[PDB]
């Protein structure tokens, strides 16, 4: 066990030697507290000149010892850096997942380990806790508490927000009709289909009525809000052989999505026939907690999790001819293994404004903002 950390400590050092051949950019920043959550804000502010542009990122803290925080970081990326903390806002309870609303990115929804969803507006707060008036207690006695992290806004209907609820359900809130300064929003719909703990949920990127959900009952379920029966979904798959922890819809193909899970596989799915898994991506050594599609490339997905590895997959190399010496290192669809993290990667987001740039966060307070070398993705050498 103690010798297993030394294997991680030495293979970090070969990676740091491997860094100028494999990356066009590596930034590494220790945060003050580890983050479970990472999402890039959609605005870029380049000034003309400076040799950089300013991009923004949504973080959180997950500690019980101090006052918790919701963090906006500014990250300077060159155009041939610096990572500072822009906003710190006092969040009550641990930040499991933090996502912005697309119809106003100042509105950020957070998922807590309690049964609620908090919503902040960062313009309506002080930028730093120069008060430092904690609301944080001295003990926290959680009894029966296991919850998943999933939280997703509808990009086609403003205010419709899903989350993974506490007793195997999915809740829908419509925050567009906010009530008259009561500031408590009850659930519009409660979706009662899964038999174990719902881990991740996501709205469809094109149709406003559809969403997908994954859970610990090995099931991917596809729903429709116009259905009168909210106890049964429209489709149900026996997706994986273990706990399904993440899903992501393809932004270029409306029928295509991908689920990653605790059987170390990322599955590939068509919506019009869910009884056939299209492809099983296999190179993770442990449990997968995040899968995200490239917003600049149809063919490209990435996955991350417990094995300290962020794999980056390429669908256009599936079924390729391969040598025995190439097949040792993985499948031909495996484009890139990141390997900067020495602890379990909790979350990652692709940058929407600079292509191939990823921020990824792990549990040893490391945030890494990186981008692989231009020769490796363009098939050029």
């Amino acid at each position: 066990d103690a010798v297993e950390e030394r294997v991680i400590n030495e293979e970090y050092k070969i990676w740091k030697k491997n860094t100028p051949f494999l990356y066009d950019l590596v930034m590494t920043h220790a945060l003050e507290w580890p983050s479970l959550t990472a999402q890039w804000l959609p605005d870029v502010t380049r000034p003309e000149g400076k040799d950089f542009s300013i991009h923004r990122l949504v973080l959180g803290t997950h500690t019980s010892d101090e006052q918790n925080h919701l963090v906006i970081a500014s990250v300077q990326l060159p155009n041939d850096g610096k990572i500072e903390i822009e906003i710190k806002i006092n969040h009550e309870g641990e930040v499991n997942r933090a996502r912005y609303m697309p119809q106003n990115p100042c509105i950020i929804a957070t998922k807590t380990p309690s049964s609620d969803v908090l919503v902040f507006d960062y313009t309506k707060h002080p930028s730093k806790p120069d008060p430092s008036g904690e609301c944080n207690p001295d003990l926290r006695l959680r009894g029966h508490q296991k919850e998943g992290y999933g939280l997703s806004w509808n990009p086609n209907l403003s205010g419709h927000l899903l989350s993974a609820s506490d007793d195997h359900t999915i809740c829908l809130w419509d925050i567009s009709a906010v009530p008259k300064e009561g500031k408590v929003v009850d659930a519009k719909t409660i979706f009662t289909g899964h038999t174990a703990v719902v881990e991740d949920v996501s709205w469809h990127l094109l149709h406003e009525s559809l969403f997908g959900s994954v859970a610990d009952d090995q099931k991917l379920m596809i729903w429709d809000t116009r259905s009168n029966n909210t106890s049964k979904p429209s489709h149900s798959v026996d997706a994986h052989t273990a706990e399904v922890n993440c899903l992501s819809f393809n932004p270029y193909s409306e029928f295509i999505l991908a689920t990653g899970s605790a059987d170390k596989t990322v599955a590939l799915w068509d919506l019009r026939n869910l009884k056939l898994k299209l492809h099983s991506f296999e190179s993770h050594k442990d449990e997968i907690f995040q899968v995200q599609w490239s917003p600049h490339n149809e063919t490209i997905l990435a996955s991350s999790g417990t094995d300290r590895r962020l794999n980056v997959w390429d669908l256009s190399k599936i079924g390729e001819e391969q040598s025995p010496e190439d097949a040792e290192d993985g499948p031909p669809e495996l484009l890139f293994i990141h390997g900067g993290h020495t602890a379990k990667i909790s979350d990652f987001s692709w940058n929407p404004n600079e292509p191939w740039v990823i921020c990824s966060v792990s549990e040893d307070n490391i945030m890494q903002v990186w981008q692989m070398a231009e020769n490796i993705y363009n098939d050029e050498d």
Partner: peptide, 14 residues
């Protein structure tokens, strides 16, 4: 050798 080194980043490239 850079496409091969992307798939084995814990081994040194050669």
């Amino acid at each position: 050798c850079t496409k091969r080194a992307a798939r084995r980043p814990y081994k040194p490239c050669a």
